[PDB]
A paper describes a structure:
FMDV, a small non-enveloped RNA virus (genus Aphthovirus, family Picornaviridae), exists as seven antigenically distinct serotypes and many variants and sub-types. Structures of several serotypes determined at near atomic resolution have revealed a capsid composed of 60 copies each of four structural proteins (VP1 to VP4). A prominent feature of this otherwise rather smooth capsid is an exposed flexible loop (∼30 residues) on VP1, termed the GH loop. This loop and the RGD motif embedded within it (residues 145–147 in the O serotype) comprise a major site of neutralization by the host humoral immune response and mediate FMDV binding integrin89101112.
Initially for both viruses 2 mM Mg2+ was included in the incubation mixture. For all experiments, the micrographs clearly showed bound integrin and no evidence of capsid dissociation. Conventional single particle analysis assuming icosahedral symmetry, yielded density maps for the complexes with the virus capsids at 3.1 Å resolution for [name] (13,438 particles) and 3.5 Å for O1M (1,649 particles). In both cases the integrin density was visible but very blurred. Comparison of the [name] virus capsid with a high-resolution X-ray structure determined here of native [name] confirmed that the integrin had not significantly altered the virus structure, except for the GH loop of VP1, which contains the RGD. In most O serotype viruses, including [name], a disulphide bond bridges residues 134 of VP1 and 130 of VP2, causing the loop to become disordered.
Author numbering:
A (entry chain B): 13 to 218
B (entry chain A), F (entry chain A): 1 to 132, 159 to 210
C (entry chain D), G (entry chain D): 15 to 39, 65 to 85
D (entry chain C), E (entry chain C): 1 to 220
Write the structure that this text describes.
């Protein structure tokens, strides 16, 4: 189950690839709308992977302990410089979450991309499967790959006041360290924006 | 039916796996445009009633099935019992514009007033959850001398990106109710 | 389309009854539900 | 003269589910463009079939752990959509707003143990009329399906619609039914070093699942 | 018998914007001839596009004078139609009776200095999200246009519609927005013996300017 | 775009001058016949109400957009709440002609009376400004025992030779209002 | 033409609903707005 994904000049190869989950669409919606009057620009240099430590999954973590990551995040690369230069942006997300242990651990993670996760309860965690999701089961895989487009009430968004996507990772079965298993699993995220579009360039500070 | 359960592809199993046969289905009651096209009452204010669909209670049918979506589109139908003359202003209007009869004003006729209102928001769809209490998007506002009853009805309803529904959690194994039945 | 069942056409035009849609340039979960794997994965004996 | 009509009594009252439309007041409003937005669903049973959601067990967990003792019953519940195990599903969240249903209910059993932990499970359907079994040898005379763990982790079983009537109620009011529409019985057969690992289970609508007569009771 | 009808409740009330017409009382009246009268306009945006009107600055003047000092900011305002600079235009006089607009706003900068007075000006668009610039070197990173005086005295710049939504409000109620829809920034670059002459500026609707959802608030 | 600014030819500039693209427009709300075809209330007199369109307040929508023109043509639509029988006489009639029921007289029916009146002036168009308080041109007169509410509605409206519109002058940089929005 | 949206033709004739127009022997600002100079006056470089 070998899969090689590539964004820009960045490559990521996995050998436990159960698949790619395309959520809510496989293609992008119409970019040039009437709200920006054709003043758009696609930034090809900003569509590449960045890495983020997510949490550490241990045995004491029971059912339902979430980790929420609002996209976009603090970014020191080109994509971070797009937010301080332009007023309106648009992108999808290519999210690749790794949880490396070995095949002698147990438990199961559920990673999901939720649009506008502003409040979450306990019981509705039971229906977190309604969103674009994959399971990370150390018996079989250690890699989850979810691709998703831009959603919103507006076709361009201003990311300093609104963050539409939220990567939530939830323990659905607690971790076991059966005699040859790993004692804890540090969980990592590997995210790359797709089809970014900017409009309305800012004045400088210089 | 065995599969890779972690790949999250949709996998359905039939009774034909153990010798049955799958029958025909009629799903005209669970489609979005049919089930949301009915009046739901909200608690009105005294005079000024900002028309947004989050005034619907979350335990009602239209409220919970509305909050099942992330995004929605609808025209609106309102039925108001009011005293005096009912006045509507669209989205983005000032509140002093509610004091003028040149704006769409239905004069009083017993027992109630039923009128159709278009989609007047500057957004392509509205939202049930906004990341950022969502932004000020609504269907305008109405006011009268006093408003006693206020009903909504979503027509041409479209929904996008579904979100959880939660049933009531029973204390014993099954949630039991008194289903209507004759005594004899 | 919704909960409407009149057979006589409407007295008012479409411009005054509803909001008019605009084109630029159901429906995903219908295709996601229709693409569900329904058979068996292994080799069926008996 | 003019055209005579008879204004009939009993007609014209405001019914909250009438097929009539209101009169307009504000014309020629053009919407912003809305074509090709992602995530469009037109029927709630499409997302009920395409997206399974977790069950609930004692301790509020979506899984069941393999016991290692003499009694080998693993889970057991009812085909009420108002059951406590079904209570956090999307299918029961739809079924609380309808009085009748029909058709197949799919259950998804996927196994989250390690690669050195093996198990063999059995799912059975006890029809209503006598009390449900406690032993897999007693449930072998039902409609059952047996499977074991391996490379493919998820097993889908389709609980069939067996009833006298072609539509079944989604609840009892409060008073009394015993356990009508029968039982779902989850049993384990064997396990090898599967002590304390989890079997998580999802539930979704079948291919011929249908759900009719809308109602509003309470609890959004 | 006669034709039965159901007089429906909720229908038939007098709405002040209904598409219905009243019943006549006084028939066959012929008007005087009215064809080919001069000055016919059918849409208010036609005369809003074809006829620009002056802006207002401090001192209640339609012009701005060239300052000769270290700070070279000449004018700066908002893309509210309810702004104080826009308040005497015909475009704001239309925009007070509508809640939403969209499209381009044209500004006309014509120069009324003598033939021995030269100048070079810069107009810039600061989008909302950060505070607007104070220096032309800071505004050079915006959408800007620079021009100088010569034989042709008027320069037209088209302020574009950049927004998240495809329609923008024409006012705030009273409470709080910061300076949404951004800023219009008028800067001068150089001048030669232009001390105290006037640059007058008009404003008009663009080619794709549209203005919808009629409303009556106050102030005829 | 440079030009001769003193020649007063209409010159428009686009966003395509700096790399944009001009979009499509829907201007069905700013045309004259649509925006003036709505009821506006005036303050009535006790019995005799001379029907001219300068009884409309200048701060209303129909009043200000009416006074935007120099010349106008319209048929008239009136809605009157009155006690007794409402009587209309055309342009040029004496006032004693208001005491006769052979002239068009709508008998009282609750709650109001809505009737259409033609253009009865001897002029080809009417005027909002007359050089010479303009001349006695109007749409006739009505009277009842008492008149409590009086609404106008211009239909088939035509306008000629536009005149200024003035918005409200703010004290600070922007004129701020309370735009209708939900509290939560 | 104006704020009317009925699709059924009127019960009354045109002689009784409106005033009838008379010929002898929109509309200027539409031509004045359409004749607006839209391009550039000089020689566009880059």
């Amino acid at each position: 189950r070998i899969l090689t994904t590539r964004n820009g000049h960045t490559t990521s190869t996995t050998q436990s690839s159960v698949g790619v989950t395309y959520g809510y669409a496989t293609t992008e919606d119409f970019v040039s709308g009437p709200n920006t009057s054709g003043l758009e620009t696609r930034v090809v240099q900003a569509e590449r992977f960045f890495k983020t430590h997510l949490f550490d999954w241990v045995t004491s973590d029971s059912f339902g302990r979430c980790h929420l990551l609002e996209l976009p995040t603090d970014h020191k690369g080109v994509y971070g410089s797009l937010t301080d230069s332009y007023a309106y942006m648009r992108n999808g997300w290519d999210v690749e979450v790794t949880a490396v242990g070995n095949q002698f651990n147990g438990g199961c993670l559920l990673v999901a991309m939720v649009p506008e996760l502003c409040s979450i309860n306990k019981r509705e965690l039971y229906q977190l499967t309604l969103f674009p999701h994959q399971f990370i089961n150390p018996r079989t895989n250690m890699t989850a790959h979810i691709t998703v487009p831009f959603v919103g009430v507006n076709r361009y968004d201003q990311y300093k006041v609104h963050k539409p996507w939220t990567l939530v990772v939830m323990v659905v079965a607690p971790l076991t360290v059966n005699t040859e298993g790993a004692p804890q699993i540090k969980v990592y995220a590997n995210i790359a924006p797709t089809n970014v579009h900017v409009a309305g360039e800012f004045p400088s500070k210089e | 039916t065995t599969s890779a359960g972690e790949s999250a592809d949709p996998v359905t199993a039939t009774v034909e796996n153990y010798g049955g046969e799958t029958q025909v289905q009629r799903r005209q009651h669970t489609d979005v445009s049919f089930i949301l096209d009915r009046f739901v009452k909200v608690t009105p204010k005294d005079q000024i009633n900002v028309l947004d669909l989050m005034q619907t209670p979350a335990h009602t049918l239209v409220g919970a099935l509305l909050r099942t979506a992330t995004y929605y589109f609808a025209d609106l139908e309102v039925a108001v019992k009011h005293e005096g003359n009912l006045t509507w202003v669209p989205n983005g209007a000032p509140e002093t514009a509610l004091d003028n009869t040149t704006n769409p004003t239905a004069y009083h006729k017993a027992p109630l007033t039923r009128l159709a209102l278009p989609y007047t928001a500057p957004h392509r769809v509205l939202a049930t959850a906004y990341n950022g209490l969502p932004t000020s998007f609504n269907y305008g506002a109405i006011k009268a001398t006093r408003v006693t009853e206020l009903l909504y009805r979503m027509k041409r309803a479209e929904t996008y990106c579904p979100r959880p529904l939660l049933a009531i959690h029973p204390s014993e194994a099954r949630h039991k109710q008194k289903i209507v039945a004759p005594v004899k | 389309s919704g909960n409407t069942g009149s057979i006589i056409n409407n007295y008012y035009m479409q411009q005054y009854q509803n909001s008019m849609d605009t084109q630029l340039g159901n429906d995903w979960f219908s295709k996601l539900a229709s693409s569900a794997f329904s058979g068996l994965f292994g080799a069926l004996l008996a | 003269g003019i055209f005579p009509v008879a204004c009939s009594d009993g007609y014209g009252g405001l019914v909250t589910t009438d097929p009539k439309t209101a009169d307009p007041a504000y014309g020629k409003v053009f919407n912003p463009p809305r074509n090709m937005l992602p995530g469009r669903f037109t029927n709630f049973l499409d997302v009920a079939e395409a997206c399974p959601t977790f069950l609930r067990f004692e301790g509020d967990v979506p899984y069941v752990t393999t016991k290692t003792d003499s009694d080998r019953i693993l889970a057991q519940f009812d085909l009420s959509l108002a059951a406590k195990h079904m209570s956090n599903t999307f299918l029961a969240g739809l079924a609380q707003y309808y009085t009748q249903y029909s058709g197949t209910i799919n259950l998804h059993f996927m196994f989250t143990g390690p690669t050195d932990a093996k198990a063999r499970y059995m799912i059975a359907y006890a029809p209503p009329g006598m009390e449900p079994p406690k032993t897999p040898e007693a449930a072998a005379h039902c409609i059952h399906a047996e499977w074991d763990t391996g490379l493919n982790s998820k097993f889908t079983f389709s609980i069939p619609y067996l009833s006298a009537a072609d539509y079944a109620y989604t609840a009892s009011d409060t008073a009394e039914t015993t356990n009508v529409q029968g039982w779902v019985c989850l049993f384990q057969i064997t396990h090898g070093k599967a002590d304390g690992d989890a079997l998580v289970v999802l539930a979704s609508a079948g291919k011929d699942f249908e759900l009719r007569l809308p109602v509003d009771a309470r609890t959004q």
